[PDB]
Amino acid sequence: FGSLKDEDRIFTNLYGRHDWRLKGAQSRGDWYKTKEILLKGPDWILGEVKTSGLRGRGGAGFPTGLKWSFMNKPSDGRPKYLVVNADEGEPGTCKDREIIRHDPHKLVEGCLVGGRAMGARAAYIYIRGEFYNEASNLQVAIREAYEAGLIGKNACGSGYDFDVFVVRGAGAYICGEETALIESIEGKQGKPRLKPPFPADVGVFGCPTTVANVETVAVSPTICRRGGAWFASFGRERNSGTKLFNISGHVNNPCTVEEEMSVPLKELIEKHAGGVTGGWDNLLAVIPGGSSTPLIPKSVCETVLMDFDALIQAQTGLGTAAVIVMDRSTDIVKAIARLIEFYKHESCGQCTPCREGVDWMNKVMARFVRGDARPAEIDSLWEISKQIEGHTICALGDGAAWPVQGLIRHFRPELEERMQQFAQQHQ
Amino acid sequence: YSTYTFLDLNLDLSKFRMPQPSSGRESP
Amino acid sequence: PLMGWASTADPLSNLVLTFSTKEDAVAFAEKNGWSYDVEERKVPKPKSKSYGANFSWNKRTRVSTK
Amino acid sequence: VHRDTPENNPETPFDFTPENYKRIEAIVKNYPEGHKAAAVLPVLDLAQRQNGWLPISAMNKVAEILQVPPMRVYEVATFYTMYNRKPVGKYHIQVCTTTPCM
Ligand SMILES: Cc1cc2nc3c(=O)[nH]c(=O)nc-3n(C[C@H](O)[C@H](O)[C@H](O)COP(=O)(O)O)c2cc1C
Ligand code: SF4
């Protein structure tokens, strides 16, 4: 990992933000060399990302480099599409929508340059309609370029070019899975399918699709434009790259910054800009993932670098790329229930473990917080959480327990004493 | 900013410039 | 015609013996010497059922709201 | 809230402005043919827009356009959130309350 950073220069993977929002020639960075890329054999791009080997921003492992050079090697009778989440499911994510808001010109390229690797046919994106204003403008961004003849059907210089069809959702979590999105792109109700039909690259719209994420297809052109040998810059021999973090919930100026891997949380939280709560003596009870990781106390987290597998060393890792912390007044038990009260409303409801199994917790979590009937429950409530893992289809269950699974870990007494606080009270 | 009026957004440049589609059939 | 219990003769009327197989089934009708009849065992077709054929390009089997 | 309708506007009636039948030419043009069969997500919502909340005769209408049995619509309008089945106001306001927003 080198020098234990993760610095930020003007040399980064994102071109500009406050400079130019509208269309043009991509005055400096973008749309630079194209006809040379596409005219060379497609699999040249395939595995040429391996110089980086992006883990992927979809909240998981499984480097993006494999799945595209993965099946969808051949082609037979039926077209292939691209479905790239723009959605945000996790509370406090916020990383998305900043990419789109002030610089859309990147991703329409990101597909066209990207889609050629798939050998795909069309391009769908998807956006939660809950963003009405910013999402409305992409069409202009599509038009303001696409109208110039930059895309389709040969554009430019190849015999292969195809346009991008925006769509919208409503009350979606649906980006909560692939093999759901490709279902509610269709117009059924969205109940995500079983994971191994034929996994997500066989059963699809009518025909094989691949579900990418935003900065997985956003940073691909610039990492195939230059690459290197700088493609692997920070992070150890395992995880490599520089992703975006967006700090939220206590800071001086919670705001995004581009930061490379293996950055410790004690300098990163304090920096960009201040630590404005107590940098210490505010107890710094932290959540690595947005909703997908339980607490860490004042322990090795602060020295624990943000590298992925570095977090699997602790009791939980995070792929979500977000930060929420706390200081003093926020009662964690009080502040984790409204993370659970959230889950109960976003779940499909097919499976018997998820449905009727999350409420069993959510109905009891309003006992502990309020303070109420006796311990030895905690010992059970742990087993429930241990009882939903292989039992649910999607990850929302595997992402349902961890907050409670990792609350019972790391804080014993805060509960034990409160059940007394109402016990002595009853007396 | 334009509350209604997705029209030309959908039907102006998109309508003419979304070729072909071939899209096949699927009769079924 | 006092209560409505349905009283009866036909003193067998309730016996079910249980044999293990046909070859040894008829074995006990002859050996005790009364008439009889036979039915046949039934088991299903093989059969062919595959999930994941339920999402189809040109096929006519494509389910919605499952 | 309850998800059954007490026969409010079975015939409201309702219809689309003839300015809107020229866009639905463009929406269906997105998708491939023969699978089209659901554009329902924009098309059902565009109808909310023309009105401002969609009564039960709005749910029955699009079926006549999209030829799907109209329990393959009443379903989709009871899953998502953004659609409002009951009437509403001129401003429908939200307060984000979640762990960070808390
Ligand atoms: C509750 C939930 C919400 C999710 N929200 C998103 C999301 O908003 N955007 C996204 O790309 N993936 C989201 N995912 C995870 C998807 O699996 C992920 O997008 C998909 O695996 C693509 O990964 P990749 O493109 O990085 O390979 C969510 C998962 C869950 C369980
Ligand atoms: S958890 Fe069970 S129910 Fe909730 S979404 Fe994933 S699968 Fe559907």
Short mmCIF file of N, CA, C and O and ligand atoms in Angstrom, two decimals, chain A residues 56-58 62 64 67 85 87-90 96 173 175-178 211-213 216 346 395-396, ligand 1:
data_model
loop_
_atom_site.label_atom_id
_atom_site.label_comp_id
_atom_site.label_asym_id
_atom_site.label_seq_id
_atom_site.Cartn_x
_atom_site.Cartn_y
_atom_site.Cartn_z
N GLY A 56 -15.39 -3.48 -8.58
CA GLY A 56 -16.77 -3.12 -8.82
C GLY A 56 -17.34 -2.32 -7.67
O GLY A 56 -16.97 -2.51 -6.51
N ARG A 57 -18.22 -1.38 -8.01
CA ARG A 57 -18.87 -0.51 -7.03
C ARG A 57 -20.27 -0.98 -6.66
O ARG A 57 -20.99 -0.26 -5.95
N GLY A 58 -20.69 -2.14 -7.13
CA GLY A 58 -22.04 -2.61 -6.89
C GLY A 58 -22.30 -3.08 -5.48
O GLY A 58 -23.32 -3.72 -5.21
N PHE A 62 -16.07 -9.60 -6.69
CA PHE A 62 -16.28 -10.06 -8.06
C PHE A 62 -15.87 -8.97 -9.04
O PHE A 62 -16.71 -8.19 -9.50
N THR A 64 -15.15 -6.43 -11.82
CA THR A 64 -15.81 -6.18 -13.09
C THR A 64 -15.05 -6.75 -14.26
O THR A 64 -15.66 -7.05 -15.29
N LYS A 67 -16.48 -10.57 -15.37
CA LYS A 67 -17.82 -10.88 -15.86
C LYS A 67 -18.06 -10.43 -17.29
O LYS A 67 -18.95 -10.98 -17.95
N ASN A 85 -27.32 0.18 -13.53
CA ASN A 85 -28.02 0.86 -12.45
C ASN A 85 -27.57 2.30 -12.39
O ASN A 85 -26.38 2.59 -12.47
N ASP A 87 -29.32 3.65 -9.81
CA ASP A 87 -30.11 3.81 -8.61
C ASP A 87 -29.23 3.88 -7.37
O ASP A 87 -28.06 3.48 -7.40
N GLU A 88 -29.78 4.43 -6.30
CA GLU A 88 -29.19 4.35 -4.98
C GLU A 88 -30.15 3.63 -4.05
O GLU A 88 -31.30 4.04 -3.88
N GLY A 89 -29.71 2.50 -3.50
CA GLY A 89 -30.50 1.89 -2.47
C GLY A 89 -30.01 2.14 -1.06
O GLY A 89 -30.78 2.09 -0.10
N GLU A 90 -28.78 2.45 -0.94
CA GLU A 90 -28.42 2.40 0.46
C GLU A 90 -28.52 3.77 1.11
O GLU A 90 -28.14 4.77 0.50
N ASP A 96 -23.73 8.30 -6.11
CA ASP A 96 -24.43 8.48 -7.36
C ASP A 96 -25.14 9.83 -7.37
O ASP A 96 -25.24 10.51 -6.34
N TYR A 173 -36.83 -0.41 -4.77
CA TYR A 173 -35.48 -0.78 -4.38
C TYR A 173 -34.76 -1.44 -5.53
O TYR A 173 -33.57 -1.74 -5.41
N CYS A 175 -32.95 -1.87 -7.92
CA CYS A 175 -31.51 -1.99 -8.06
C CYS A 175 -30.89 -2.78 -6.93
O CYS A 175 -29.70 -3.11 -6.99
N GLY A 176 -31.66 -3.08 -5.89
CA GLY A 176 -31.24 -3.95 -4.82
C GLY A 176 -30.80 -5.32 -5.29
O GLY A 176 -30.21 -6.10 -4.53
N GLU A 177 -31.12 -5.63 -6.53
CA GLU A 177 -30.60 -6.84 -7.13
C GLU A 177 -30.60 -6.61 -8.63
O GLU A 177 -31.40 -5.83 -9.14
N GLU A 178 -29.65 -7.22 -9.31
CA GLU A 178 -29.89 -7.69 -10.65
C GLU A 178 -30.79 -8.91 -10.57
O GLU A 178 -30.98 -9.50 -9.51
N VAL A 211 -25.63 -6.70 -15.93
CA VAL A 211 -26.04 -5.63 -15.04
C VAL A 211 -24.77 -5.02 -14.48
O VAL A 211 -24.11 -5.62 -13.62
N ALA A 212 -24.43 -3.82 -14.93
CA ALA A 212 -23.26 -3.13 -14.45
C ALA A 212 -23.65 -2.08 -13.43
O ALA A 212 -24.83 -1.91 -13.10
N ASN A 213 -22.67 -1.36 -12.92
CA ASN A 213 -22.92 -0.25 -12.02
C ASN A 213 -22.35 1.03 -12.60
O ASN A 213 -21.80 1.05 -13.70
N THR A 216 -18.45 1.56 -12.36
CA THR A 216 -17.85 0.44 -13.04
C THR A 216 -17.80 0.64 -14.54
O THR A 216 -16.80 0.27 -15.17
N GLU A 346 -38.94 -1.98 2.63
CA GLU A 346 -38.39 -2.09 1.29
C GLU A 346 -38.37 -3.51 0.75
O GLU A 346 -37.86 -3.72 -0.35
N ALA A 395 -29.95 -10.62 -1.54
CA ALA A 395 -29.06 -10.21 -0.49
C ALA A 395 -29.75 -9.39 0.57
O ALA A 395 -29.16 -9.15 1.63
N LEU A 396 -30.97 -8.93 0.33
CA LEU A 396 -31.58 -8.03 1.29
C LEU A 396 -31.75 -8.71 2.64
O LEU A 396 -31.72 -8.03 3.67
C1 LIG E 1 -30.87 -3.17 -0.81
C2 LIG E 1 -29.92 -3.15 -1.97
C3 LIG E 1 -29.78 -1.99 -2.68
C4 LIG E 1 -28.90 -1.96 -3.75
N1 LIG E 1 -28.78 -0.80 -4.44
C5 LIG E 1 -27.92 -0.76 -5.49
C6 LIG E 1 -27.82 0.43 -6.17
O1 LIG E 1 -28.51 1.37 -5.80
N2 LIG E 1 -26.98 0.54 -7.24
C7 LIG E 1 -26.25 -0.55 -7.61
O2 LIG E 1 -25.49 -0.49 -8.56
N3 LIG E 1 -26.35 -1.72 -6.92
C8 LIG E 1 -27.18 -1.85 -5.86
N4 LIG E 1 -27.30 -3.04 -5.19
C9 LIG E 1 -26.51 -4.28 -5.49
C10 LIG E 1 -26.50 -4.92 -6.86
O3 LIG E 1 -26.16 -6.27 -6.64
C11 LIG E 1 -25.37 -4.41 -7.71
O4 LIG E 1 -25.72 -3.21 -8.32
C12 LIG E 1 -25.09 -5.41 -8.80
O5 LIG E 1 -24.57 -6.55 -8.17
C13 LIG E 1 -24.10 -4.87 -9.81
O6 LIG E 1 -22.78 -5.05 -9.35
P1 LIG E 1 -21.52 -4.62 -10.26
O7 LIG E 1 -21.99 -3.88 -11.49
O8 LIG E 1 -20.61 -3.72 -9.46
O9 LIG E 1 -20.77 -5.85 -10.71
C14 LIG E 1 -28.16 -3.08 -4.11
C15 LIG E 1 -28.29 -4.24 -3.38
C16 LIG E 1 -29.19 -4.27 -2.31
C17 LIG E 1 -29.36 -5.53 -1.52
#
